[PDB]
Design a protein around this ligand. Structure first.
Ligand SMILES: [Cl-]
Ligand code: NA
Lengths: 127, 47, 160, 157, 128, 127, 156
């Protein structure tokens, strides 16, 4: 509910605005941000089959997109980011994923841990 | 060197002022060319 | 699929057929006064004889804008006049700009347009062929001969 | 369809919803160029109300015709008068949207009730061009016109 | 003979025509370009001595003039006009407005813009 | 019958050209006359509900469009212009409407008399 | 239509032909965006196969979405990014064509039977952009990707 609270409506407006400005005209910073955000949220919601994800692992990967860490990266590398990010949190941070599974929420402690993890992870990917 | 230079102005500026002086001094009838030509249609953009 | 969908498509394309018909008519009008001012400026330009690209603001004219944009990145990778020059070629070479220009192509391009370009301190342009086709001594005396002939080469690329 | 077609005549006011509008996130997905009422008259609701309601319908109806033309031929072929009415129309579409209290579980936004006085003033100002400087998405999914101004500053960072 | 050319952005006057002599102004004096001559303009008169009798008179504001190894010339003018289409009464009034705006303005860049216009308009009344 | 035949023809000239009214800009004076005049005449066909007019009131309003006294007026302000103009000519010039109904046409006397009432009201209204 | 519509369910692979594709000269006139198989699976066919198949269907579907704009104005009015996908997609569409042994009388060309290794490899090279410089009709009615280079050299 936290990470995908206003995601359903925002993605509907993204497809409206993206389809509207197909022509290569100049636009303000607020609408190009919506396009920049909406493209990379769509790449997160891509998913293969015969491997369904647990609620906490879904919450982890949606965090990166919705809180804005993916915005500067290229659209084509978002699926690569997600796989590397998901396998990393499965490896080391089982306490954090476990704490979201036990509680059923993102605490301000867990928010601060994810904030530290994704920012340091992003700097590695961008280089 | 030149009174028009020193201050900073180039020959293309010298040419634009001289050419405007000729078009400004006409007998009405032939200003149809001078209104169409010699326009400032270009806009300056910079980042 | 639906009758409501197909009736909407006919409603729009009927207007576009009339608008496209109108725009070739307006293009033919501007083509007339562009041709009649060509041969006076052509002998002037040929008699006269940093990457600059020349086209216009207005689109919907085939690959006039993209042709000059293709040869700029060619000259840039080895080693702009028009709003469509920026929209296409800018974000890729954003740190390689001196000046960019707007409000061109609509009205006839004058000599005063070439001066304003030169004042702000090879050249790429589309040379005309036919209705269908196109194709992409003292020390200080030479100083002023350079700057006026520079405005003539920029003016030659504008009229073509 | 015979069922809804027959129902219209039995009604004093009609609120026609569209899948096309809901598809774009615009909730409530009311068709502004299809919903009607008997009381929409300058003698009943006053001329200031009436003249704004028709002004909203005009700018939306004029925009509806353009949409299909400017999807192919591009935005830059429009007049400066037209692309003014295009930008205003798109903001007006978004300011017709509203987060309901009963729909809080779908939107993710707090429910808002907008009084009739602040509704008319909101669409008055957008018609006149008082928020042409402000961006597009600030009008989407907010209660009164004041929230658009506040949300516009929030989208700066 | 000489392959003489003389044109402007708007209009063209001559194009490889057989002319005897063409006097043209410049920044330093005024060269008379005869057919025999060795390998920058100023506001002044362009006198064109034709092959037979008559001598027409033009005026040129600014630009450049070329003299090649072979007998060929192309005089380039931004605004070339004849004495038939030049007003004397307005040229005096333009010279007053220029000299007016000289005695007042103090900016170092602007005085150049005024003093060029004084020179250009003073070249018109010399002819007119 | 005098003003209707003239109006009908000019609207036909408009309706062909009107599809590229907005998409034109660099248009010649022939089509710009038809596009201007046609938008003016269309606005005169607009009318309020529950206020049906007498024939002499209609022809005066159409005549203003046909002879082209409203050609420079802003197209958006024609419906409001007409509503005030109608109240003015009914209130003050009640004898003028008597002439049009009696004579069975807009005579040369009425032409000149109505010409003064339009051109003065036009400059006063648009300010 | 009820007859074909019901038949889909009773199948493991569907090769859907097209008149639109047939009229443009592409034979066999298969729709690459309307034909499916239940073994199109990276576990069955291998991950290299699957990626090259879905990559071809992506660039074909991207080209299909532009067809309203290309029909009116043309290929020249698109952006440089959009024209590059169109040029590859059209080269793919023609490389999807092939001369059949049973249809030698109709075509004129000799019949070809391309092995699975060179089928993947050919479309894999085209997606990467190793033949953006080559023309379109060089890919029309050829067996392996080698014949597309050989056909292009004779033209120049
Ligand atoms: Cl009211
Ligand atoms: Na095949």
């Amino acid at each position: 509910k936290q990470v995908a609270g206003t995601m359903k409506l925002e993605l509907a407006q993204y497809r409206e605005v993206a389809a509207f400005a197909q022509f290569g005209s100049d636009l303000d910073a607020a609408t190009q941000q919506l396009l920049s955000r909406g493209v990379r949220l769509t790449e997160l919601l891509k998913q293969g089959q015969y491997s369904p994800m647990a609620i906490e692992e879904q919450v982890a990967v949606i965090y990166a997109g919705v809180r804005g860490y993916l915005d500067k990266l290229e659209p084509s590398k978002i699926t690569k980011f997600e796989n590397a990010f998901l396998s990393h949190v499965i490896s080391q941070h089982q306490a954090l994923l476990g704490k979201i599974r036990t509680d059923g929420k993102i605490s301000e402690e867990s928010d601060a841990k994810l904030k530290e993890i994704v920012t340091n992870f992003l700097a590695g990917f961008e280089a | 060197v030149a009174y028009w230079r020193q201050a900073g102005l180039s020959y293309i500026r010298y040419s634009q002022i001289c050419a405007k002086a000729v078009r400004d001094a006409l007998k009405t009838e032939f200003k149809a060319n001078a209104m169409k030509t010699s326009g400032s249609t270009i806009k300056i953009v910079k980042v | 699929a639906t009758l409501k969908d197909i009736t909407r498509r006919l409603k729009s394309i009927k207007n576009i057929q009339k608008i496209t018909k109108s725009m070739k008519m307006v293009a033919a009008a501007k083509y007339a006064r562009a041709e009649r001012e060509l041969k006076p400026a052509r002998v002037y330009g040929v008699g006269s004889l940093l990457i600059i690209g020349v086209s216009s603001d207005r689109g919907l004219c085939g690959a006039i804008h993209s042709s000059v944009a293709k040869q700029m990145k060619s000259e840039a990778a080895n080693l702009g006049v028009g709003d469509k020059i920026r929209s296409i070629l800018h974000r890729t070479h954003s740190d390689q700009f001196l000046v960019t220009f707007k409000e061109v192509g609509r009205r006839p391009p004058t000599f005063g347009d070439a001066s304003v370009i030169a004042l702000e301190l090879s050249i790429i342009f589309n040379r005309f062929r036919s209705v269908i086709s196109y194709k992409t001594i003292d020390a200080d005396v030479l100083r002023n001969y350079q700057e006026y002939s520079l405005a003539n080469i920029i003016y030659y690329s504008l009229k073509e | 369809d015979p069922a809804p077609a027959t129902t219209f005549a039995h009604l004093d006011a009609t609120t026609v919803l569209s899948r096309a509008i809901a598809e774009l996130g615009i909730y409530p997905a009311v068709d502004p160029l299809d919903s009607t009422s008997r009381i929409m008259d300058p003698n009943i609701v006053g001329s200031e109300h009436y003249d704004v309601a028709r002004g909203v319908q005009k700018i939306l109806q004029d925009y509806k015709s353009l949409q299909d033309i400017i999807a192919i031929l591009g935005m830059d072929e429009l007049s400066e008068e037209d692309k003014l009415t295009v930008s205003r129309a798109r903001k007006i579409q978004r300011f017709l949207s509203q987060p309901f209290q009963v729909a809080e579980v779908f939107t993710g936004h707090l429910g808002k009730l907008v009084p009739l006085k602040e509704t008319i003033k909101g669409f008055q100002q957008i018609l006149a061009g008082e928020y042409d400087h402000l961006p597009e998405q600030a009008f989407y999914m907010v209660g009164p016109i004041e929230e658009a101004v506040a949300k516009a500053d929030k989208l700066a960072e | 003979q000489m392959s003489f050319t003389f044109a402007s952005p708007t209009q063209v006057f001559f194009n490889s025509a057989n002319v005897r002599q063409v006097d043209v102004p410049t920044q330093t004096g005024a060269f008379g370009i005869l057919a025999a001559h060795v390998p920058v303009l100023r506001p002044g008169l362009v006198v064109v001595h034709a092959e037979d009798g008559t001598t027409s008179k033009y005026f040129v504001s600014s630009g450049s003039v070329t003299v090649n190894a072979d007998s060929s010339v192309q005089l380039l003018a931004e605004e070339a006009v004849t004495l038939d289409m030049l007003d004397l009464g307005a040229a005096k009034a333009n010279l007053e407005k220029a000299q007016s705006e000289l005695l007042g303005a103090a900016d170092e860049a602007t005085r150049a813009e005024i003093q060029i216009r004084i020179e250009a308009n003073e070249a018109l009344v010399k002819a007119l």
